[PDB]
Design a protein around this nucleic acid. Structure first.
Ligand code: ANP
Ligand code: ANP
Ligand code: ANP
Ligand code: ANP
Ligand code: ANP
Ligand code: MG
Ligand code: MG
Ligand code: MG
Ligand code: MG
Ligand code: MG
Ligand code: MG
Ligand code: MG
Lengths: 260, 260, 260, 260, 260, 260, 260
DNA sequence: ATATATATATATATATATATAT
DNA sequence: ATATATATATATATATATATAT
């Protein structure tokens, strides 16, 4: 049972992907853009479910490689490091395509990146956290989208919009957008119960996320999916660590106070 | 028919060159400058039809090569990468002339570029996106225009003007200019219908630039050719994907909202 | 006896760790977060007992190394220098893990830090004085917590909260918190006597921290564990230097006036 | 006649040297400096007639070579490329003297340059666009002037003055100067008519550059010669291309608007 | 004749300089100050003929440049922009002397301004609208007058006097003054007729500005030269637009009512 | 004689140093302070004779340099520019000592300034117009006076006193002071005649500055030496320009009215 | 005797250290803090005897170096320059310890400073004029005191208190303080006579600082030691320069008036 | 003969922050 | 509250001769 307890904390520790309306709308939108080689920017709030949705979109299309040829990777997802220069972006791109870099000058990296990017038949390049990369590499992402006909989707906090706003063409080129929903309302109530069954995975305790727990969670999370996830996992881990089989109102008040 | 559908999305995906007053004025202007070996700068807004017009001008004069001699390329078009140094500009120039570079020092590249640039009888050097190249290569483009009697036409967003403004001679040498029109008015109404027949190549809805669709498009595109094209292709692709044979007002409202 | 006097001033000079409710609550909280790989921020006042408590938590879990393998360091504690850049943070992290740095570029440091951070099985990364590091390294600490599943605990004065407030995701990601108590009241009275026996270590003088000395110390320290420790050590050192065997009211009034 | 038209556009395309007070003052000044082996710097505005005047001075003294000995080149004119290093300056100098370079180290180039520079009896070294060469080659031009007794005349935009100002001896050594005139006033009126007869070379049209055309040209050129020339050649080419035998007010308004 | 009508409205549109006692007194005064390198302030009312008089004084002494040396500009006239800082004043000064600015720090601008201000042998620096520049640049104008021995003449509305009054030395240094006359009386009657012949330039209509028109104009203009000019030009333009060959009493009553 | 007239206006244009009780008291005071390395501040009114007196004190002690060693400059006089930062003050100091600055950081300038300031054996540092320099450079002037034992004499309008008043130590350190006299009374009467013989230098006209001219000048100048000088030079120049051999009462009334 | 006179002015010129109750209290206080590695801030007025007292404390403990090892410098005194950055503070610290700096980055300086600061066994770091250093170096002084167990004593005018007040921990960490006495009263009377014998060193004149001279000095100095010293030295120098063997009431009235 | 590190500093902003001002 | 210098520590690519030891 302590073996089972180790299973429980490890399983609750790792995150899951519970499919809700947000990620489905995002996938539909991204399919629409990718069929049209259209570069959009999918902006949203922070702690709201953007990176997970882009990852899910990256996975449903896992590259199916020909028996002996370079794998046709339709969607490429990279999330650059802080102040990603043009060299670093190319390193990340050609790394995700699983071509190790040969040491060279920025131009050599650019040339090799274009070569493996046309070779692997990339259709969409999702740059997550695209407010990090420097203004002098938006020129190269513009170049990629400009010549290879690749739908570049810049993901990022609202800060990304101002980041593209002070530049001129990036703002013109990346103008189709899709704001992440806040999720508040009856749909938020569904999500709450959806987390109980899908992710929490506990023997049914007849909790049912009643208006009390819902008031607590609307009070605490403010609608952010992260916050829903962080709070519920913490409460579950706490309750199982103290022997409680289900989640009490006590531990819910605990995590509520220790956030706000 | 699904075969036909694949034909339709692929054809709508790729862009066309619909000839309108803007590109014709530009060609006439560039012919005037080229007959006089006059270096101008053709500035304009962003998402407005500059690169396409320069490309069209590059194509009508496709080089006619002597049977065995280097091809006389009258117009050379290059659009340098971000922070194009003097070496990189020469690489791009001598690449467009189809002479592969022999590895060497910046001086060697300069000498070879002058040699193949006088050899191919180049008359005009259109540097698109000429706000990218560094201030220390305007000296070399000045040198080219200075010694080879070649009309250098710098294309770029308005940022290019400030870019040449802080330098001194580039501003004096490149002072003849041609602003890209915004196109708004009755001429915009013509363009709208001109896109229906030329580029959309779909069964006519008999809209004839109907004032409703025109209000929508004036409302949405703000006159940018780049926005009429993006919107119309998206609406066409959407309507054909959902089975609709023509474009409904519904999908037009869709793309309108998803831009602004 | 002068030998004994040297022992006394040296022992009073060095600090001790007297276990009280604050550090116990902190350890319990940090255990809860670490079992859940949950990143919190344990904020509090200044001169209040945060660094000492984090150090005590670092020590109870001293790494138990396999006979010949890299030591599994469960908790890593670093307190960066002023304006810690991303390179400097990685240097400190990989230093605490006892891997000397090989000279390289910021990317190389990042890669090596991730490699030794997954190797040593780190579970928690306590960044003390986490208001120092620059905004452009919160991205990397976000990245660490993001990919390695490591509970990053940012410690700091209240200034840290504003420091994370102007940034966007750091504020969302680090939202569970634990304010340091001020300690005032009967519990403060206990602490006072607890310092007499544990840390002061003097032959019993029947002082007993009577309401007079308590009024003085509540008057002087304002509850900060730092002010009590500083005051009591000074008074003890003074009294032993002037030959007094216990602490008089005179020296207590002395240190009281010389603070406020 | 179309043959004649080709003659006309080709003749108008190429530039001429119309002798006016500016170049005459410059030649007199340079003769004075050269008789005294005096290094000056002839600064001026941009688009004003400096390079042409230095070239004219270079040509009136074309080297008269002894029957079989190295030609005594009294005046040497070079205009270095961007960031001319010490090696590059020597290459240009010994190239202008028509001694091909033998591949070697910077020292070897220096030694050979001194040898051919004393051999050809050079008296004056006009470095046009002398704001290009790097600060570490002003030492070598100082050396040349210091040992060979050669009047080094640095030509350049006003930026050259600041370029020598941050260095110390170059500023002391090159302190005699001659600012290029702006030419505005009655003398500008003469120049205008002087361009009609000398350079435009058209059947007399009784235009006579009347106060109207003079207001236009003062309005447009702002006195810059190289602007009077650009405008007049363009207007002439346009008028001859559209069949007009003389220059109309229409085409003058055209070029006026298309500059400012 | 419509051609003639276009000539008439264009000629009436542009202003002239009719020489009257005010500008002559000002020139005599400024000559007296300039021979003595004496800094005065020529204060006056608003809409009264100060800027025009200073301009006329600037023009009679148009700089006569040596054949090849910097032009000796005896009088320099600048009218700074709103809240002219010390950098901006130097930019305007060295611009009027036709030396383009090299980008630098405020100190660099100051040094270059002193260098070109002693070089061009400037004798008088007329700062028109000298109530605009900030209090922290009166120090620099004091410095100029202080070291170069240059007669600085501050022009401005009466607000300028209070502007110098709250500062201390500017008030002491700029104390010689010359108030602009209001012009009312018989001399105003002369001016009225002087505007008919000099500036209005119409076939003689035997109007002669009789006591009626004089009562109207004394009633309307209140003596301000600007209002006379404004009124007379408007009446002339109106009368010529409605076909009237001379100015009727009707249009004079019109402009009179539409001012007051 | 017109040659003589040019001599007269040029001689009257340039200023002289007529020695009167004010400058003698100042020199005695400054000698007393300098023998004692005492930092004072010699405050006074504006337009009163402070800068001239400090200059005269600077000149009587012209540095006597050893045959080959750095010149021992006992008194150093600088009058900083507006908002003189710490770098700028050091530039001015080490400039007056005739050591050109080597480009560096503020610290490097400080170190070099201390080195050449101890080398040239400076005894007194007269900062004229010492209300200009910023509050953050009073620290460095405090430092100079603090370490080198150099009598720093801050000169300035009364505004300087408030400028040092809001700072704390500058006010304590610079507290010995010497107010400039207003000069009104019989001593003013002497000065008046002293200007006739010393500075005006005219054939004796038996004017003798009688009670009438004295009433005029007391009425006009209010005792300021500047105004005494400004008025007398203007009247002399006017009278000599209009042919008058001496100064009439007419021109005295003229300058009187044109000041007040 | 003139030789003797040169001895007298030179001896009076240089300052002495007359030991009075203020410096003795300060030394006792600093010994108490240093035995306890306690960081205090010894605040006081300006022109009151703080720097001299800290210097005297620095000298009584002159480092006694082992025969061949780094000298154990117990007390380190530095008084940073204006806006001392973190690099500059480290330069000053490691300079006072007589280790010349090896050129490097701010981090390298920090590391070397910690290394030589633990090596020389520093016990106390007296930062005189500690209101100069920037807020971003209080972090490093906090760090020093934080890790090396070094009693950092910040000296400064009252402005230092506000300087630490707007920061947060510096105010908490440096809270023990010692205000400089104003010295007024009978103790001031003693000091007065103590300056006669100790510092003035004159043949006894039976002056005895009688109530008259005491009223003058209380009237003039206001108790500041700095002013007693300044006044007495000036009066002594004056009286010896004018031949007077003792100090008269005349010269005392002189310096009194020339201060206030 | 040749590739070879091998430093070579070396620019150029590069923002980036921080006043200080109205 | 919005704007404008201004010093400054720093990271970065880069390309240039350059000796030099097989
Ligand atoms: N569809 C989902 N299913 C399950 N968990 C999710 C889902 N979306 C988000 N989360 C949780 O939310 C957190 C990650 O959300 P994330 O997608 O990173 O938001 P984010 O906005 O992309 N982060 P950031 O963009 O940097 O502010 C994790 O705790 C996930 O468990
Ligand atoms: N004449 C044209 N015919 C058809 N499509 C055109 C035409 N001109 C522009 N476009 C469309 O506009 C987009 C390209 O316009 P483009 O010429 O690049 O503007 P641009 O200003 O040069 N881009 P940029 O300069 O970087 O802001 C594409 O979507 C084209 O389909
Ligand atoms: N004396 C002249 N006769 C005829 N054309 C002239 C003359 N001087 C200048 N030009 C024209 O002016 C242009 C060249 O002027 P130029 O001498 O290069 O000015 P510049 O200042 O040297 N150029 P730059 O120094 O780089 O700003 C050409 O168009 C010439 O035709
Ligand atoms: N001497 C003149 N001859 C002709 N028109 C004049 C003359 N003086 C002034 N004006 C007219 O008056 C107007 C300009 O007067 P102006 O000299 O600017 O007065 P001002 O006081 O300098 N303006 P301002 O100082 O800003 O109040 C124009 O309409 C001129 O036509
Ligand atoms: N001793 C003197 N002999 C002759 N002229 C003098 C003398 N003192 C002052 N002046 C005149 O007064 C003017 C300069 O006086 P100045 O010494 O600058 O006063 P100031 O107070 O220092 N100026 P400022 O401090 O900025 O208000 C000049 O016109 C001098 O000719
Ligand atoms: Mg995210
Ligand atoms: Mg484009
Ligand atoms: Mg702490
Ligand atoms: Mg030129
Ligand atoms: Mg005006
Ligand atoms: Mg003065
Ligand atoms: Mg002090």
């Amino acid at each position: 049972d302590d073996e089972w307890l180790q299973a429980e904390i490890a399983r609750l520790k790792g995150k899951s992907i519970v499919p809700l309306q947000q990620v489905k709308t995002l996938h539909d939108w991204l399919d629409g853009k990718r069929k049209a080689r259209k570069s959009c920017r999918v902006v949203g709030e922070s702690r709201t479910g953007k990176t997970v949705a882009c990852d899910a979109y990256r996975y449903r299309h896992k590259p199916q490689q020909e028996a002996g040829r370079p794998p046709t990777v339709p969607v490429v997802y990279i999330r650059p490091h802080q102040k990603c220069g043009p060299k670093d972006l190319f390193k990340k791109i050609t790394e995700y395509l699983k071509y190790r870099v040969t040491k060279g000058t920025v131009s050599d990296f650019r040339d090799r990146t274009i070569e493996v990017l046309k070779g692997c038949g990339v259709e969409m390049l999702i740059i997550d956290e695209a407010d990090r990369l420097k203004p002098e590499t938006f020129a190269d992402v513009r170049d990629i989208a400009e010549d290879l006909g690749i739908a570049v989707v810049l993901v990022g906090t609202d800060r990304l919009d101002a980041v593209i706003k002070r530049d001129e063409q990036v703002l013109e080129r990346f103008r189709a957008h899709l704001r992440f929903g806040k999720l508040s309302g009856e749909d938020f109530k569904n999500t709450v119960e959806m987390w109980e069954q899908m992710v929490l995975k506990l023997p049914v305790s007849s909790n049912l996320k009643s208006k009390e727990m819902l008031r607590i969670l609307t009070s605490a999370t403010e609608g952010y999916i992260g916050r829903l996830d962080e709070i519920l996992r913490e409460a579950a881990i706490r309750s199982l660590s103290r022997g409680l089989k289900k989640i009490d109102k006590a531990v819910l008040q605990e995590v509520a106070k220790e956030y706000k």
